[PDB]
């Protein structure tokens, strides 16, 4: 359709106005004393949230040039959430500071591209300084402190996440889901579990719990559809001679074979339980192979050249206990030589490194947890649904931050680390005066998060900023207690990865937004 | 689409205006002297109701920020109705009081998060005090008093509900349905009944009542579809040799077998009645197994491995008397050893505890009632349809309240228990002054229900509040007769669960609404 | 529908206004100190771009006569992008200059058609002078300089492109795609690779990398669907006697033959791998023949009169190594007499010259690269997506300019070559005074690019134009460092083809736009 074209300063002031609208909505939620934003949903009740990316993803403006400004600055929060899972409000604050100072410098007659180059140079040096400034975060106390800070100063969340990470291991996974009570609870599963139950309730030998319990059984992994009992006769007779239970994990069992099995189980001839093979497609094949490796058996498949009639006891795995419920099957203490498990998890790590989508990566990580580590689930308790959503979002933030802090280390929080870095980079210069101005723009914008944190508390940002800049080390300001001290000693920790990611994404988007001259959009 | 964004006090005043609209509509119906609200329905005549959640679910406003406020406060009443079945007007009153005082405290420069923490601490202590303050409610007189109070001071409803609870027992169920006369009537069913009638009117041997009566029958429980009589000759021959009637509960009976049975019945050879198996799917299997357990028989099914031709007299259950009508079949005084019945009902209560949806839980409760207790039905009598609906809603409120009062106990009603609790918590303090202000906010808000009850009567709420606060024990105000006295002696009882749930949900939602700073919604 | 008709000067002023809107939007991005334009997209975030054709393709206006002017001048940028891949902003600037001067001359009472003839004569002479003025660009240093200049003064892009062209060769191809990191990387493939992997994971003999590696195998090129192994035995028996592996490239393999192959490979009988034939249809046939030519084998097809059962060792090709992954197949150091390779690539060049669409030509070039040269891929690294898109467009511009500079040579850049040409053509005259005025119009318009480049830097265009015109040789003005000097030694190079194309297309469209007298469009 027809277009509207704006040139120079008109375009820049419209763009800055849109940036300011979105940033002012987002920034009221930063720090221990930030507040909540109520978001109207077309289908349902409003959501009350303190998360930056959630607020940013809803903002759209009536004016089209201001809407372009807002849509451009939204990508910083989106990208920070995608990369680190936390630190989106800080990224937005930094982006707005850089855009404001850069537009001020441009209006004074500077070349925008040289300013952009200076900003890039300053941010590169800053990232190197941050990497030099970090310390490892390995003990459980520091992990508790990180989880507490990221969950808006909630000690119970930090303690629960530290316990979960200690119990599940370095190779395990932790998930968050809705609870049923009013208190948070942690349930950890050891061994392998897949969401497949028995195919016939008559298999139950322990009606007290409604569960099928087998001690030291055989596992027959059938990679095929079984409908006719004629195929299973040899293995069933062999196991009956053996005198110990059997478990069938197959693609499916039809009416005739299932009927024969249930008739035989209740007569006392054989103890047989049958469940479905988990997954659909290639992943189903992979997880059958994984169970074979864990249990020390061989998968019976037509695509390799073996028939189920010719199966012997050597193709059957073994375990110590098998417990089957209506929904989940667990295999406990299965026999398998370790080298096979380490080799399999090694291969899975290589296709982990060669994975693009996050869904595939998380499925592979869940497989590694099943084979080697554990799986923990945290249930969130709340009285209502809005409270449940808000608490669940906080818990997910804490979990992401603990992961990042483990994988890269921690720096002093509260905006102090960026101030220390900018103090260290005070003697950096570029090629021309515009580049030096851009370096100064970046270094000045590096103090915005602390100033906004102090504003949200109702204090004076510049007095606190001067007092913190006058100190050295981990000296900082505690906004929860309104006192100065050691950031590390009072437990205000930030992961290095979150700070670095926020700085990088903010600089990347703002440097481009500084260099605009014309804006082309549709008509009202 | 494009959005509208409001910051700070403007957002808070719009939100409070919406809260006030909804709360002022709901609160006029509180107490013995509350009034009715007329709700327009697009399809039909208007509904005249005195229930809080029914009024709350109807309100929607033109302005979008006020609509956000109303939509958020509606969840308190929704959740209270879902949890306790009663006490939603009290929850709405408490939520409005907390929101009003909290916004007043926020406008004075307090930190909303510390106020929220103080409110949480106060409510936790209050719930503990309420638990300490209750007394058991086990006799029939107290249950009658609770049912009377919850039905808007209607003696007959309380007496009827107490009689039903006495006749049916602890393990039975009671339902409410529309009547045909002008008087309430109670019909209680003893034994097991399912809604399946005879498959052929020719089976009727007693045309005076149009009913099929069999004495000491056999019950053949066939878990299969019978169409050819050839499968079934042996059991008919054996029963004919036995000389006493037979009952066939099967999936269905086709024309040929039904014709053979009906021909045989009218010649005096065998007394046979045929009915359909209740339910559809797995629940039908469970019901057939329940009848087998009650009657001491064996279900004939192909999936476990017996054929109906090989059935003997041991697979047939026994009873004392069977009466079949056009719609219902009843089995009275079945012959079966008790231990099977207790085992089955225990099993069922274990999968009751592991049930998520209320529909599944109430189906299992129906099954337990059929196996062990009884089923009662209360028909409501009224001249018109609007009166019928209003009375039926009152009766449902009364029945829910009696259940809650049995399961947790009673406290003194009229808003007196909350006043006693707030008097007890007068020395509670937090960590900083903001939290102390929040504690005071919660304690002040606990007096709102009594004040609104007195205001609905046309009296002075503050004079009555002062007089009641000056007393001790169960001293309170009777708003029906405008007299002070002992709450327990005059029979104004409230379940503990209703009070506790109202307090918890109101606090949970209001604490979050206090901490708002920005609102984002669509443009007009 | 109904039309609007405008005559003469009214039409011309509306047309010039539209031309000016489009040109003024496009021209802000010209030179080393041009800026970016933000383009709104209906689906997605805005795009920030510095490319002339991208900006031009977006402009549409409200007035229909101005819209006709804009839509007419848009074809210059479109055609320059189609022809050379670069120089669209320069073409637009030249077109606007010619149109403005020509309309001024027409308003003075000149014949438009003689002006058009004079403009054509001047442009023909200018193209001849440009061809005489060039020097070859063959060394890698000049290639790096061209790539650097065309990428907006980015040294790394030029160095990477020079390395890629050095490693791949004259007959190879280079492609640009999105990266994953923050740094640019170059990956070059030697030999032939096609993008189908193995047909069964059981073929993998090296689980460490998940790759199938075969040493000196045979290649059986079957242009047939293999489903029954009966057709296939003799060649497997022959190669089992031979004792060295085999590779099957076929249209596809069904379950039976694949099962036989996999069950044989794992038993140590024969080492067999099966992959799909690349392409769909005739191109599949052509690249199958190409693999036959490279590996020294014969394609087994029914359309020529041979059957796969009668195949012998002569029909099987040979190689040195074969590496198959999940996605790509790699054939390294295949045995084949060179004369066949040169014959095949020469033939492919003959149908290259006889190709119309660009898609067919680029597919042909890919096949030439696979048979003779190499294939390189450049991944672009950036922190966000807008930055990635902007950098990727810059890299593509650089790659196109480097190709053009290879194929035609370089001239002095910065607008200096056009000034030298126009200085040389100062004595050119036509047939009548109108044609002389047209020649002068073209010569004056030839100085517009330098003036706009100097204007975008904040300097005075006329002072710099006079100073550069007063010089000789490659003497020019460096707008990056604001210094005068020699273009060649400071490395500001432009391809001859880009300059010539811009001049030709701009003159072609502007000359026709000059001769307008009436405009007919729809009604508002
Ligand atoms: N008690 C405290 N004193 C000072 N700074 C704090 C305190 N608690 C948290 N912070 C800082 O506030 C920031 C938390 O902001 P947050 O709302 O989590 O936004 P983001 O999405 O950027 O993480 C962190 O950078 C943290 O260092
Ligand atoms: N005679 C009475 N005197 C004082 N209070 C009463 C009397 N009867 C009922 N109430 C109180 O009125 C409240 C009932 O209000 P109601 O309209 O049922 O609202 P809700 O939905 O909260 O139950 C109860 O808290 C009860 O204690
Ligand atoms: N440092 C420089 N000094 C002077 N002229 C330059 C310099 N760098 C590039 N140029 C000139 O600027 C022009 C580049 O404009 P550009 O934005 O690439 O538009 P186009 O799409 O027409 O190539 C080229 O003609 C080049 O000769
Ligand atoms: F309004 Be409540 F349900 F008594
Ligand atoms: F804008 Be052109 F493609 F350099
Ligand atoms: K936040
Ligand atoms: K009410
Ligand atoms: K350009
Ligand atoms: Mg955070
Ligand atoms: Mg009630
Ligand atoms: Mg270019």
UniProtKB/Swiss-Prot annotation, chains A, B, C:
Q: Which residues are ATP-binding?
A: 29-32, 50, 86-90, 414, 478-480, 494
PTM text: Phosphorylated reversibly during heat shock.
Presence of the UniProt keyword Acetylation in the record: yes
Tell me the leader sequence span.
none
Among InterPro entries, the record links this protein to: Chaperonin_Cpn60_CS (IPR018370), Cpn60/GroEL (IPR001844), Cpn60/GroEL/TCP-1 (IPR002423), GroEL-like_apical_dom_sf (IPR027409), GROEL-like_equatorial_sf (IPR027413), TCP-1-like_intermed_sf (IPR027410)
Where are residues bearing N6-succinyllysine located in the sequence?
Answer: 33, 50, 116, 276, 320, 389
Principal cellular location given in the protein's record: cytoplasm
GO cellular component terms listed in the entry, alphabetical order: cytosol; GroEL-GroES complex; membrane
- From the Swiss-Prot or TrEMBL record, state where the protein is found: Cytoplasm
Q: Where are residues bearing N6-acetyllysine located in the sequence?
A: 116
Outcome reported for the amino acid change (mutating residue 397 to A): Can bind ATP with normal affinity, but is defective in ATPase activity. Binds non-native rhodanese, but cannot release the protein
Known Pfam families for this protein?
Cpn60_TCP1
Q: What is the effect of changing residue 75 to S?
A: Complex stability is significantly decreased.tuberculosis
| Complexes and interactors | Forms a cylinder of 14 subunits composed of two heptameric rings stacked back-to-back. Interacts with the co-chaperonin GroES. Can form asymmetrical complexes, composed of one GroEL and one GroES, and symmetrical complexes, formed between one GroEL and two GroES oligomers. The asymmetrical complex is the functional unit. It was suggested that the symmetric heterooligomer may represent a transient intermediate in the chaperonin protein folding cycle.
Q: Which HAMAP family match?
A: CH60
Name the protein family: Belongs to the chaperonin (HSP60) family.
Name-wise, this protein is Chaperonin GroEL
**What species is this protein from?**
Escherichia coli (strain K12)
């Amino acid at each position: 359709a027809a277009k509207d074209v704006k040139f120079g300063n008109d375009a820049r002031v419209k763009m800055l106005r849109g940036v300011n609208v979105l940033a002012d909505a987002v920034k009221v939620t930063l720090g221990p004393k930030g507040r909540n934003v109520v978001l109207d949903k077309s289908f349902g009740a409003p959501t009350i949230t303190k998360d930056g990316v959630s607020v940013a993803r809803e903002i759209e403006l009536e004016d089209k040039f201001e809407n372009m400004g807002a849509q451009m600055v939204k990508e910083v929060a989106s990208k920070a959430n995608d990369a680190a899972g936390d630190g989106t409000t800080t990224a937005t604050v930094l982006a707005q500071a850089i855009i404001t100072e850069g537009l001020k410098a441009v209006a004074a007659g500077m070349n925008p591209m040289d300013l952009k180059r200076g900003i890039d140079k300053a941010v590169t040096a800053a990232v190197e300084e941050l990497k030099a400034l970090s310390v490892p975060c390995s003990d459980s106390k520091a992990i508790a402190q990180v989880g507490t800070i990221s969950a808006n100063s909630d000690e119970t969340v930090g303690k629960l996440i530290a316990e979960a990470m200690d119990k599940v291991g370095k190779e395990g996974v932790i998930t968050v889901e809705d609870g049923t009570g009013l208190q948070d609870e942690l349930d950890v599963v050891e061994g392998m579990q897949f969401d497949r139950g028995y195919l016939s309730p008559y298999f139950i030998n322990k009606p007290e719990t409604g569960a099928v319990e087998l001690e030291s059984p055989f596992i027959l992994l059938a990679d095929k559809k079984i409908s006719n009992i004629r195929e299973m006769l040899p293995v069933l007779e062999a196991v009956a001679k053996a005198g110990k239970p059997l478990l069938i994990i197959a693609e499916d069992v039809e009416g005739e074979a299932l009927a024969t099995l249930v008739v035989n189980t209740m007569r006392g001839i054989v103890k047989v339980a049958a469940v479905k093979a988990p997954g659909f497609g290639d992943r189903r094949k992979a997880m059958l192979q994984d169970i074979a490796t864990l249990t020390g058996g061989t998968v019976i498949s037509e695509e390799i050249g073996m028939e189920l009639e010719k199966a012997t006891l050597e193709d059957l795995g073994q375990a110590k206990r098998v417990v089957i419920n209506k929904d989940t099957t667990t295999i406990i203490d299965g026999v398998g030589e370790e080298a096979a498990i380490q080799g399999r998890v090694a291969q899975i790590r290589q296709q982990i490194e060669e994975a693009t989508s996050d869904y595939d990566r998380e499925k592979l990580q869940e497989r590694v947890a099943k084979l080697a580590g554990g799986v923990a689930v945290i249930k969130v308790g709340a009285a209502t649904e809005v409270e449940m959503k808000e608490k669940k979002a906080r818990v997910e933030d804490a979990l992401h931050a603990t992961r990042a802090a483990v994988e890269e280390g921690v720096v002093a929080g509260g905006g102090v680390a960026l101030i220390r870095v900018a103090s260290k980079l005070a003697d950096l210069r570029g090629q021309n005066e515009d580049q030096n101005v851009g370096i100064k723009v970046a270094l000045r914008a590096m103090e915005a998060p602390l100033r906004q944190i102090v504003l949200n508390c109702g204090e004076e940002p510049s007095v606190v900023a001067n007092t913190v800049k006058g100190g050295d080390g981990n000296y900082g300001y505690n906004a929860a207690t309104e006192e100065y001290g050691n950031m590390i000693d009072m437990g205000i920790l930030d992961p290095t990865k979150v700070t670095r990611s926020a700085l990088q994404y903010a600089a990347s988007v703002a440097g481009l937004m500084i260099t605009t001259e014309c804006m082309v959009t549709d008509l009202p």
